[PDB]
Design a protein around this ligand. Structure first.
Ligand SMILES: *C(=O)CCCC[C@@H]1SC[C@@H]2NC(=O)N[C@@H]21
Ligand SMILES: [Mn+2]
Ligand SMILES: [Mn+2]
Lengths: 91, 671, 312, 192, 95
């Protein structure tokens, strides 16, 4: 394993979310990541903004489904995403 | 490993050890069984049988042990099926799929697949059992007694033939077979074979339609299976001798088909006898079909296709011994009042139950059904909501509720229907590449009368030439060519004939009058000459002598039906050929499938040889392959699944070959 | 009389059972959980089914009712529990026999009698074995197999003395240093208990040796991890025999080929090591990650009953 | 004066409130207010064919006002409904051009024109004209492909939950954003 | 453009927009003229007498509110306005 020092930036292939696993938040539409609001290990309340994404000049605000702790944040600011890409994990 | 012929080849030295000789030998067999080396032919199967031989397990063996054992040499290739699958997925992932837009494997929603246990379905006694107990006549007598409207689902056939270019795979059907068995436990029949399915299954989907039939049969043992059967050629593409029609009906009935809807593309009764007699012999249900054209409401529309035309035609088909009279409204031309008036009249006319089939292309299908039901229709063809409407059949879901407050109810399970709709709503998504461009009701069908698909197919075709702008004239010419040909019934292939002329005439700028004047040098399309040759049967009105002359250009037209002119097919020759081509033993299904579609069948066997049984793959994987980091499961039996993970694809090497890094059943592999 | 077999376990032990059963020409069935979707034991069997699609990957293997649901829906007439899950569970065996499925192991009262710490001591007093106090102890346990036909034998002792806290580390078979007649008095005392309560199938009697005396500790009523070590010196296959006892076969019969009591002897010595993911840098704690490179050995003397580590 | 249709007057078990005589009382009340026309807005397309016949039949006996009926074809029974209402003497109906009709939209005017052939009452319009309009809008609709609805099939589950317009699509989009996409049956049920 | 799938400006089928001369339209006397002549009470009395089913076209409003997120613009409505005037000359109203 070798980390590629910023040459691809966005060309990072994210895993696909388990659609049956209620802990997995997948991307509903393809787009860009504008703002990452939460970190791995942070406690959040239901409906709290976790991510802000940009689809077609439109900003979507991805929220927490329930009360829980974030276990993995897949993306960073400016990252590109495809429908079904895993974005967040919570408990 | 690179194996070279320069040394004493030795792959593994296997040694076993136990307290007894018996156990040590059994461990050896087990070990050799666990051994799997692909790519080069080894010596394992010989070693296996050597240990397996009883003359060895006892001990007391000589140096002539090999010489004195005939059964030690055996022909067993061990067909590497998994590799073949890895190659297919490998190919489609890299190079794509026919008529599928090359893109990353799309995101799909989870299709929750509702299930009914097999032991519950085995307890059901539906119309299949009825036929087994009372015969074909007994079924018809029973249908006539029912006050409720019985239904026939078309989801497995005509629905996706209309909406999705017949592309719906066996896999998607098999997954809801056990639920469908339950939902339609009280239905008359499930149309699931015939039409373009036989041809499309073999050719486009590269899967065996007989296996679809046989696998649905097991899973749905309670409901009658229905198919569409064209009188001239059954399920084929040309003309065939009588013994070919007979062989196909024999085989289809054995395989599980119970109701054969027999139709003729020109309503010519003579061409329906051979199919009828074949079905009678098979002890199955023969539906005598009247195709619908014109408009019985408009007396200015035809001096031929009037109400008494259809009554005399019904009365005739009843005398022919058909168990059930079916009305096939192929272009969706049976207007609501016309339906009421027609079925109403035919009920007095004949004593057969009436089985009505229409398309919702005008958007008046449910109304037609509602009206027919008032007139006392016995059975109607419907589709699950998500696979219904427009060029498909009316929505069963819609109709169920539409009749609320009216005398006759639709005998079915709505909860079940809603459930099925949701299933198919998600599945349909897998087939978006094959979605028709028709997305709203078209009432111009009442002028041009283009059946089923045509209107879109003949729009692409009009564009594929230079007529894409002036499709207004095509629509008109189509209606004129119909009247030029003496007002004919328009279904396959009669529909292609009229279609082809409409294009041709518009293209070469032909009048009705100048098609005779210049006809001596015109060179008409092959389907047209064929029609005026009688190669698809006799039209009701016959042929204009002059037009026929001008088109045939000296050729003789057939007097009797096309089938009579044909040399009977020697099925032994067919067996002798197909056995040479393949490993060895060949079935009757193979034989008749070849006769109907020689080239298509041949190409199918070529794909089967290469990629194995493709029907088992799930549709998304079939069409798109796999994305990087994906794991795919392929069900074979209970707990007999192939687990395939795709890691990466390399860059193309010197020969343009890409190396695919797989993980199958835990074992790492490279394709 | 067994057609097909299910293994209620995972990993190395399952693979060992499938190999034994396939040698007896018996069809094999395997179960897995959410996190063992790609465990090796899933593939080495003829049939593989998911247990508890909703329940967690840890609890999934310890669900008595759901494992029976799989066995029933597959025509399974025999289940091998393996070790360290439902192997010492009493109500699993009761439930198995209730559904007409042979539990491969001792009978209902044997697990009941050796499950509790107190009852697995009341039996030893009733069969003349010591307990109450210890210094400089030598951990020795004897392997015992008995059929359903009243024939019970021993397969000598194991030297399980090399151990940390609540964990065995290195085993030795047979035991070193102990006088020829000391190990005799241990094995005889082991049979003393097991022949007394009519023990069936595979089992172990744990002793604690100090100076020159036996001391009963506990009974393991199944196959242990360190079972392989004994098979190599004795020659007899433990796991195989387990299945054969379930069919109702005699010990010294033509099917097991078990030698007589004075015919069973040890050949050479044997040593076992378990290859886990523990290390003194994290103080013997497991780690998560893909196994990038797996390098295995083999050859003479080296025995490999693998199951967990591979390609990555 | 508009009456929003809800419930199912065919089903005595459905509501004790939205009865045939609830609609009569409401219409008569709106008449005295001096509305020139009484209208029936069927926003969720719940007015079943027979129910339409019953409701318009009674309301024409109840009030002297012309009845202007407005339905959506989301159930798939819109045209049948309109036909039945016409049989009961409805004065005005809301239709759409074919290529802009069906499903969550109005029933097709083009289809209805021909549907009524052979029946006593005839739709006052220009078919040749409407076929042309339909062809036009079929092309214009192409420009608006990014805003197309999710719906492609009729939906009869509307008779249980009663969600109007596109809501059963929108609220599903909403359900996905809250992580209830795999549990939409629970949402539909709770809505009811 | 916001919420527009970012593809290059597509090739469309040309619609040859049917038109009716504004002179012909000026001679028409539908329900707008009726309102001017007999008023709202009168228009209602007239609808009672009519045996034919009268229609209201929702193409300009509810149809596209339902199917296209109410996005249909004025330019597309005004283009067939003259033709629509002729087609629906005997329709009750345009929504
Ligand atoms: C493209 O060449 C990749 C190979 C895909 C072959 C499959 S098999 C079924 C479909 N029918 C066909 O002729 N090709 C497709
Ligand atoms: Mn059809
Ligand atoms: Mn509305």
């Amino acid at each position: 394993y070798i980390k590629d020092e910023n040459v691809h930036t966005n060309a990072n292939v994210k895993p696909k979310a388990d659609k049956s696993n209620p802990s997995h938040i997948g991307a509903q539409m393809p787009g860009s990541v504008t703002e990452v609001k939460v970190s791995v290990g942070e406690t959040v309340k239901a409906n709290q903004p976790l991510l802000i994404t940009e689809a077609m000049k439109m900003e979507t605000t991805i929220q927490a489904p329930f009360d829980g702790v974030i276990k993995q944040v897949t993306v960073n600011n400016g990252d590109t995403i495809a429908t079904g890409d895993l974005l967040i994990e919570i408990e | 490993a690179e194996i070279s012929p320069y040394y004493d080849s030795l792959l593994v030295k296997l040694s076993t050890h136990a307290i007894s000789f018996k156990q040590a030998e059994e461990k050896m067999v087990r070990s050799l069984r666990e051994m799997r080396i692909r790519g080069v032919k080894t010596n394992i199967p010989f070693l296996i049988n050597v240990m397996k031989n009883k003359k060895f397990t006892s001990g007391d063996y000589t140096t002539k042990f090999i010489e004195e054992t005939p059964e030690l040499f055996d022909i067993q290739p061990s067909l590497d099926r998994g590799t073949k699958t890895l190659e297919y997925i490998g190919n489609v992932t890299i190079n794509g799929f026919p008529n599928v837009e090359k893109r990353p494997k799309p995101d799909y929603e989870l299709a929750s697949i509702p299930t009914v246990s097999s032991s519950k379905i085995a307890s059901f006694s539906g119309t299949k059992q009825l036929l087994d107990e009372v015969g074909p006549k007994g079924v018809a007598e029973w249908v006539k007694k029912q006050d409720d409207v019985l239904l026939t689902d078309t989801t497995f056939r005509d629905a996706h033939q209309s909406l999705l270019a017949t592309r719906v795979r066996t896999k998607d059907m098999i997954n809801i077979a056990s639920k469908t068995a339950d939902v339609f436990k009280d239905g008359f029949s499930l149309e699931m074979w015939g039409g373009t399915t036989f041809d499309v299954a073999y050719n486009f989907l590269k899967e065996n339609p007989w296996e679809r039939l046989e696998r649905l049969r097991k899973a749905i043992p309670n409901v009658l299976f229905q198919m569409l059967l064209r009188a001239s050629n059954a399920v084929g593409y040309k003309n065939y001798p009588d013994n070919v029609i007979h062989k196909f009906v024999q085989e289809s009935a054995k395989a599980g088909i119970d109701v054969f809807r027999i139709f003729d593309s020109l309503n010519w009764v003579d061409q329906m006898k051979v199919a009828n007699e074949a079905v009678q012999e098979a002890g199955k249900i023969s539906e005598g079909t009247i195709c619908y054209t014109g408009d019985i409401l408009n007396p200015e529309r035809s001096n031929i296709y009037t109400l008494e035309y259809y009554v005399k035609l019904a009365k005739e088909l009843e005398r022919e011994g058909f168990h059930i009279l079916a009305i096939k409204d192929m272009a969706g031309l049976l207007k609501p009042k016309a339906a009421y008036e027609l079925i109403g009249e035919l009920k007095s006319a004949v004593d057969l139950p009436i089985h009505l089939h229409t398309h919702d292309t005008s958007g008046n299908g449910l109304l037609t059904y509602k009206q027919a039901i008032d007139a006392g229709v016995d059975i109607i063809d419907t589709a699950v909501a998500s696979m219904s409407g427009l060029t498909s059949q009316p929505s069963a879901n819609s109709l169920y509720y539409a009749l609320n407050g009216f005398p006759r109810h639709l005998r079915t399970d709505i909860e079940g229907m809603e459930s099925l709709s949701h299933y198919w709503s998600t599945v349909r998504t897998y087939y978006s590449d094959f979605e028709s461009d028709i997305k709203s009701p078209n009432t111009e069908i009442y002028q041009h009368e283009m059946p089923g698909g045509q209107y879109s197919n003949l729009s692409q075709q009009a564009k594929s030439l230079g007529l894409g702008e002036r499709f207004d004239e095509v629509k008109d010419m189509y209606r004129r060519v119909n009247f030029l040909f003496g007002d004919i019934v328009k279904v396959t292939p009669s529909s292609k004939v009229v279609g082809d002329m409409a294009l041709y005439m518009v293209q070469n700028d032909l009048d009705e009058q100048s098609v005779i004047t210049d006809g001596y040098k015109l060179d008409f399309p092959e389907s047209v000459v064929s029609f005026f040759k009688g190669e698809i049967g006799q039209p009701v009105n016959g042929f204009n002598k002059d037009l026929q002359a001008v088109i045939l250009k000296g050729q003789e037209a057939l007097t009797a039906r096309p089938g009579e002119y044909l040399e009977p097919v020697d099925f032994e020759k067919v067996r002798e050929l197909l056995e040479e081509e393949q490993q060895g033993p060949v079935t009757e299904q193979d034989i008749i499938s070849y006769v109907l579609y020689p080239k298509v069948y041949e190409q199918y066997i070529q794909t089967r040889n290469q990629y194995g049984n493709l029907s088992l793959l799930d549709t998304p994987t079939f069409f798109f392959g796999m994305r990087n980091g994906e794991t795919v499961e392929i069900e074979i039996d209970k707990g007999k699944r192939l687990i395939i993970k795709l890691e990466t694809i390399s860059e193309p090497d010197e020969n343009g070959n890409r190396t695919i890094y797989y993980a199958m059943n835990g074992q790492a592999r490279r394709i | 009389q067994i057609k097909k077999l299910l293994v209620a376990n995972r990993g190395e032990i399952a693979i060992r059972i499938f190999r034994a059963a396939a040698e007896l020409d018996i069809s094999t069935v395997a179960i897995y959980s959410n996190e063992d979707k790609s465990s090796l034991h899933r593939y080495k069997a003829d049939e593989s089914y998911l247990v508890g699609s909703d329940l967690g990957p840890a609890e999934s293997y310890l669900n008595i009712e759901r494992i029976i649901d799989v066995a029933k829906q597959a025509n399974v007439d025999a289940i091998h529990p393996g070790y360290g899950f439902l192997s010492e569970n009493e109500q699993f065996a009761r439930r198995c026999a209730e559904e007409g499925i042979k539990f491969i192991g001792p009978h209902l009262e044997h697990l009941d009698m050796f499950g509790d710490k107190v009852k697995a001591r009341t039996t030893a007093i009733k069969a003349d074995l010591p307990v109450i106090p210890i210094d400089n102890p030598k951990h020795i346990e004897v392997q015992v197999i008995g059929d359903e036909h009243g024939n019970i034998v021993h397969l000598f002792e194991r030297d399980c003395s090399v151990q940390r806290r609540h964990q065995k580390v290195v085993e030795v078979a047979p035991s070193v240093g102990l006088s020829p007649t000391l190990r005799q008095r241990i094995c005889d005392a082991a049979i003393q208990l097991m022949e007394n309560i009519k023990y069936v199938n595979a089992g172990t009697v744990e002793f604690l040796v100090s100076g020159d005396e036996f001391f009963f500790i506990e009974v393991n009523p199944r196959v242990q991890v360190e079972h392989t070590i004994t098979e190599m010196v004795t020659g007899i296959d433990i796991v195989k025999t387990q299945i054969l006892v379930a069919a109702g076969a005699d010990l010294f019969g033509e099917e097991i080929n078990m030698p007589q009591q004075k015919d069973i002897t040890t050949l050479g010595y044997a040593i076992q090591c378990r290859i886990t993911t523990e290390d003194p840098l994290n103080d013997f704690m497991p780690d998560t990650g893909t196994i990038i490179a797996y390098r295995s050995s083999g050859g003479f003397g080296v025995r490999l009953d693998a199951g967990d580590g591979f390609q990555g």
